[PDB]
Amino acid sequence: SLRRGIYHIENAGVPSAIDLKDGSSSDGTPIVGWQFTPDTINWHQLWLAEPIPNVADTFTLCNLFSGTYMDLYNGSSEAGTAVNGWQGTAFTTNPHQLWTIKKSSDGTSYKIQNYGSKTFVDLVNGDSSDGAKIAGWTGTWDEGNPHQKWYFNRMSVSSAEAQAAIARNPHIHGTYRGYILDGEYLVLPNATFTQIWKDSGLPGSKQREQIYDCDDFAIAMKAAVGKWGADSWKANGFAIFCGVMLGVNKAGDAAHAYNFTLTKDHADIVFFEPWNGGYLNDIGYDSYMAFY
Amino acid sequence: SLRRGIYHIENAGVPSAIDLKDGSSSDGTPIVGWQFTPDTINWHQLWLAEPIPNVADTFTLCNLFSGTYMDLYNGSSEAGTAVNGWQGTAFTTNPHQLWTIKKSSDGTSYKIQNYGSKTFVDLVNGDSSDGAKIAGWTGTWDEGNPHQKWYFNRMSVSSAEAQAAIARNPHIHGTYRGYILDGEYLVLPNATFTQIWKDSGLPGSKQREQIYDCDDFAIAMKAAVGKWGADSWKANGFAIFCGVMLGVNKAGDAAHAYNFTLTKDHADIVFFEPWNGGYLNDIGYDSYMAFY
Ligand SMILES: C[C@@H]1O[C@@H](O[C@@H]2[C@@H](O[C@H]3O[C@H](CO)[C@H](O)[C@H](O)[C@H]3O)[C@@H](O)[C@@H](CO)O[C@@H]2O)[C@@H](O)[C@H](O)[C@@H]1O
Ligand SMILES: C[C@@H]1O[C@@H](O[C@@H]2[C@@H](O[C@H]3O[C@H](CO)[C@H](O)[C@H](O)[C@H]3O)[C@@H](O)[C@@H](CO)O[C@@H]2O)[C@@H](O)[C@H](O)[C@@H]1O
Ligand SMILES: C[C@@H]1O[C@@H](O[C@@H]2[C@@H](O[C@H]3O[C@H](CO)[C@H](O)[C@H](O)[C@H]3O)[C@@H](O)[C@@H](CO)O[C@H]2O)[C@@H](O)[C@H](O)[C@@H]1O
Ligand SMILES: C[C@@H]1O[C@@H](O[C@@H]2[C@@H](O[C@H]3O[C@H](CO)[C@H](O)[C@H](O)[C@H]3O)[C@@H](O)[C@@H](CO)O[C@H]2O)[C@@H](O)[C@H](O)[C@@H]1O
Ligand SMILES: C[C@@H]1O[C@@H](O[C@@H]2[C@@H](O[C@H]3O[C@H](CO)[C@H](O)[C@H](O)[C@H]3O)[C@@H](O)[C@@H](CO)O[C@H]2O)[C@@H](O)[C@H](O)[C@@H]1O
Ligand SMILES: C[C@@H]1O[C@@H](O[C@@H]2[C@@H](O[C@H]3O[C@H](CO)[C@H](O)[C@H](O)[C@H]3O)[C@@H](O)[C@@H](CO)O[C@H]2O)[C@@H](O)[C@H](O)[C@@H]1O
Ligand SMILES: [Ca+2]
Ligand SMILES: [Ca+2]
Ligand SMILES: [Ca+2]
Ligand SMILES: [Ca+2]
Ligand code: NA
Ligand code: NA
């Protein structure tokens, strides 16, 4: 089954993503095909998939920016029926907003079936245009039709995935303890991570003994990413990935506080130095504590 | 010996504190007697005492606000010599800024002797006026003269004192681990702690599942106290006390993140709820992790 998480949903036939037009929270805002930039935040094109209990392979899809739900208009089974953003809730019984999401016949892309209508999310005519209609359409689970096939490009990690990435890092002290704060995290491109750092005001902060030293920089950077999360997204039920670590050098006579993020493939952590905005595979310390 | 730490220095004869006039960083700013309010930050009346290596019971005294040092003018041994704020460094060899500080004959108050002149810090005539002259004056270590006797009212804790306060709290989980970030901390009155909370903007923050929940509130409050430290004080070599704790309820099926501060007597911790600005002796959780 598709994991709970945040997805960038990309048509299998043409490089168009599922896009809530202008990110509007208005009821009945069109959901359309739109081009995208890899290794960015695609602000209108992120979807939180929430599994429904006691309904196999069935989800709500909440737009991360608008906090509104992918909705088949009046649940109609007519081919060409509008797919829109609409107000709802994560565990609604409204079948207009319930979507069965299972692998296509190519074993990699998915099809997205409305739970009520049993019709499929369809990029009409495979139109690659920006603002191309997406509709509910007749189809089958097994057919090759790329209009109705969608890559779910996973943008989030579970706490368990983050814990795995840390555990397979070689720069962890024997005495390490990790403290998990949330359940599901949006992984930032370094470009975005860096922009939050710049916007924090840390780049202009002076290192001062105890009163604003490494621990103040690291905790300030985490607070700044936390604030950016709440201020940026209207959806709930996830966090933004930004770690704090305390580390000790090899000689065991110097400690340091710093941040860490995750690679694009979600497999490994990268250390961030909030003094100078550097990314390092080796920051010259072994982490004895992390919270994230 | 007097501990390294931050002190509010209060005359034994009249309720006047040692005050750097208008907190000015200007060289030659008068240091004067001035009245004070207990359980506040007395902005111009806090002094960081830094022990000198290989000189017994001898210190620099740095004004926490100005970052300038208590200085006997031209190191003169003449009675009535000005005591001023002056630019210097924590481990200076300038005897104008070096002060031997040992218990008076009453065993509770101290006398403050210039290391160069061997004359004593004197509230001239015991004048209780706001802006009364403080000078270097002839005297002895043993005499009762209250003009030259000074209570060192300790405003800071060592990391060891903070660790003791946590350890004698009854709301600590069996699995607790504590992570120490700095060495010496200014303890805030609750009135000040509360004001930093209000000024953070947290009072108007909405609790949102994962994206701005208890851990975001607690880390935001710590960052806010860290920022207030750096922005408020020009001295270095200390931090502001504000803790983060993670806790678990008695049933072991609910966790919470929150802050903690220290009592006026520095002996115990008090829990702070950054959701609503409440202080609690029991927040209904046992702490399994803290960083401070
Ligand atoms: C190029 C075209 O592809 C397929 O048609 C699609 C449509 O496919 C879907 O709807 C049709 C009925 O209209 C049928 O139910 C099919 O099984 C289902 O996948 C649909 O995707 C529309 C809207 O984008 O575009 C095309 O018309 C195929 O059936 C056609 O023969 C033809 O090869
Ligand atoms: C009331 C007064 O108290 C004492 O005199 C102090 C001064 O005391 C100090 O200086 C004197 C010499 O002027 C002497 O060296 C003494 O041992 C030393 O403590 C001084 O504090 C000034 C400035 O505030 O005020 C008083 O004059 C005492 O010696 C006097 O006899 C008298 O009791
Ligand atoms: C918030 C906004 O984001 C961008 O504009 C969006 C646009 O974003 C996508 O398409 C553009 C080209 O139009 C790029 O490929 C981006 O990488 C995509 O994410 C669409 O989502 C449309 C339709 O909803 O809305 C626009 O606001 C960007 O161009 C803006 O400057 C701005 O940052
Ligand atoms: C059958 C119908 O179901 C609900 O109305 C849906 C509507 O539902 C959502 O939005 C409305 C406000 O328009 C309410 O907030 C619901 O709580 C939401 O779930 C949308 O799905 C639209 C667009 O497809 O269709 C309506 O039929 C319900 O509110 C109605 O009373 C009625 O039961
Ligand atoms: C920063 C400033 O602090 C207060 O004024 C100081 C003053 O503070 C002390 O004396 C006042 C009465 O004048 C109260 O007792 C305070 O509790 C004391 O801390 C002195 O330090 C003088 C001399 O240096 O400077 C003033 O600025 C306060 O009254 C101001 O509103 C302001 O907050
Ligand atoms: C003997 C004298 O000592 C120093 O001058 C002090 C002076 O020292 C401090 O302030 C000056 C600037 O005025 C420098 O930054 C020093 O580094 C500071 O330690 C003050 O103590 C004043 C007031 O009592 O007295 C001067 O004598 C030194 O700079 C001189 O060259 C000279 O060696
Ligand atoms: Ca949480
Ligand atoms: Ca610090
Ligand atoms: Ca530190
Ligand atoms: Ca959180
Ligand atoms: Na399910
Ligand atoms: Na010493």
Q: What is the DSSP string of A44-98?
A: T--EEEEEPTTSTTEEEEEETTT--EEEEGGG--STTEEEEEE---TT---GGG-
Subunit contact A212:B222, Cβ cutoff 8 A: no
Beta pairing class for A156-158 and A184-186: antiparallel
Contacts of A159 (CB under 8 A, 6+ apart): A180, A182, A183, A184, A185
- Give the helix/strand (H/E) hosting B290: strand B286-291
Helix (H, G, I), strand (E, B) or coil at B270: strand
Please report the sign of the dihedral spanned by the C-alpha atoms of residue B200, residue B206, residue B207, residue B211: negative
- Asked whether the beta carbons of A289 and A255 are under 8 A apart, the reply is no
- Asked whether the beta carbons of B221 and B241 are under 8 A apart, the reply is no
Contacts of A206 (CB under 8 A, 6+ apart): A212, B230
| Nearest-atom index, ligand 5, CA of B20 | 24
Q: What is the DSSP letter of A187?
A: P
List residues bridging with B123 in a β-sheet. Answer: B134
- Ligand 6 interacting residues, C-beta cut-off 6 A: B 27, 71, 73-74, 86-88, 92, 94, 96
Q: How far is CA A93 from CA A77, A96, A97, A112, in A?
A: 18, 9, 8, 17
Residue indicated by tokens 């107000």: A87
Subunit contact A213:B238, Cβ cutoff 8 A: no
Residue B182, burial from CB neighbour count under 10 angstroms (0-12, 13-18, 19+)? buried
Residues B265 and B267: their CA atoms lie apart, in Å, by: 5
For the record, the structure tokens of A289 come out as 């504590």
Subunit contact A183:B210, Cβ cutoff 8 A: yes
The candidate with the shortest Cα–Cα distance to B147, out of B30, B31, B33, is B33
Subunit contact A210:B235, Cβ cutoff 8 A: no
Residues A101 and A7: their CA atoms lie apart, in Å, by: 12
Phi and psi of B245, rounded to 5°?
-125, 145
Residue indicated by tokens 């997204």: A233
Helix axes A214-232, A190-200, angle to 10 degrees: 110
Cα A8–chain centre separation: 8
Residues A175 and A162: their CA atoms lie apart, in Å, by: 19
Residues A205 and A4: their CA atoms lie apart, in Å, by: 39
What is the biggest distance separating any 2 CA atoms in chain A, rounded to whole angstroms? 71
For the record, the structure tokens of A230 come out as 């709440």
What is the biggest distance separating any 2 CA atoms in chain B, rounded to whole angstroms? 71
Please report the sign of the dihedral spanned by the C-alpha atoms of residue B222, residue B224, residue B228, residue B231: positive
> Which residue type, as a one-letter code, is found at position A68?
T
Hey, of B50, B181, B202, B242, which one would you mutate to test binding to chain A, going by the most A CBs within 10 A of its CB?
Answer: B181
For the record, the structure tokens of A28 come out as 């009945």
- Asked whether the beta carbons of A159 and A180 are under 8 A apart, the reply is yes
Helix (H, G, I), strand (E, B) or coil at B155: coil
Residues A189 and B150: their CA atoms lie apart, in Å, by: 58
DSSP output for B27-93: TTEEEEEE---TTS--TT--EEEEEPTTSTTEEEEEETTT--EEEEGGG--STTEEEEEE---TT--
Torsion of CA B173, B185, A179, B245, to 10 degrees: 40
Residues B40 and B195: their CA atoms lie apart, in Å, by: 11
Where do the domains of chain B lie, and which CATH numbers do they carry? 5-153 (2.80.10.50), 156-291 (3.30.460.70)
Out of B181, B227, B257, closest to residue A215 by CB: B181
Neighbours of A218 (CB within 10 A): 26
Q: Backbone dihedral region of A151: left (phi > 0), alpha (psi from -120 to 50 degrees) or beta?
A: beta
Please report the sign of the dihedral spanned by the C-alpha atoms of residue A235, residue A238, residue A242, residue A244: positive
Residue indicated by tokens 């710093």: A258
Residue indicated by tokens 């999310």: A121
Question: What is the experimental method?
Answer: X-ray
Q: Whats the size of chain B, residue-wise?
A: 292
Q: What is the DSSP letter of A250?
A: T
Helix (H, G, I), strand (E, B) or coil at A287: strand
> Which residue type, as a one-letter code, is found at position A190?
N
Residues B96 and B114: their CA atoms lie apart, in Å, by: 7
Out of A177, A179, A230, closest to residue B216 by CB: A230
Q: Classify each residue of B223-255 as buried b or exposed e, where b means 16 or more C-beta atoms within 10 Å of its C-beta.
A: bbbbbbbbebbbbbbbbbbbbbbbbbeeeeeee
Beta pairing class for A81-86 and A69-72: antiparallel
- Quote the minimal CA–CA distance from B148 to chain A in Å: 32
Residues B183 and B157: their CA atoms lie apart, in Å, by: 8
- Quote the minimal CA–CA distance from A101 to chain B in Å: 25
CA of A48 to the centre of ligand 9 (A): 38
Q: In what order do the strands lie in the sheet with B269-273?
A: B172-179, B286-291, B243-248, B255-262, B269-273, B278-280
Let me know how many helices (H) and strands (E) chain A has, helices first.
3, 21
| Nearest-atom index, ligand 5, CA of B34 | 10
The candidate with the shortest Cα–Cα distance to A243, out of A213, A217, A212, A218, is A218
Please report the sign of the dihedral spanned by the C-alpha atoms of residue B260, residue B263, residue B266, residue B267: negative
Subunit contact A230:B208, Cβ cutoff 8 A: yes
Residues A45 and B166: their CA atoms lie apart, in Å, by: 47
Residues A18 and A32: their CA atoms lie apart, in Å, by: 6
CA of A240 to the centre of ligand 10 (A): 8
| Nearest-atom index, ligand 4, CA of A73 | 24
What is the end-to-end Cα distance of chain B in Å, rounded?
Answer: 27
The candidate with the shortest Cα–Cα distance to A4, out of A115, A157, A181, is A157
Q: Whats the size of chain A, residue-wise?
A: 292
Out of A183, A212, A246, closest to residue B230 by CB: A212
Neighbours of B290 (CB within 10 A): 22
Helix (H, G, I), strand (E, B) or coil at B292: coil
> Which residue type, as a one-letter code, is found at position B126?
G
Residue B64, burial from CB neighbour count under 10 angstroms (0-12, 13-18, 19+)? buried
Residue indicated by tokens 């903007």: B201
Q: How far is CA A122 from CA A95, A108, A138, A222, in A?
A: 18, 17, 9, 40
Q: In what order do the strands lie in the sheet with B156-158?
A: B156-158, B184-186, B239-240
List residues bridging with B6 in a β-sheet. Answer: B48
- Asked whether the beta carbons of B188 and B262 are under 8 A apart, the reply is no
The candidate with the shortest Cα–Cα distance to B246, out of B202, B291, B207, is B291
For the record, the structure tokens of A51 come out as 């599994």
Residues B254 and B283: their CA atoms lie apart, in Å, by: 13
Residues A74 and A94: their CA atoms lie apart, in Å, by: 10
Q: How far is CA A94 from CA A71, A115, A117, B63, in A?
A: 9, 9, 12, 65
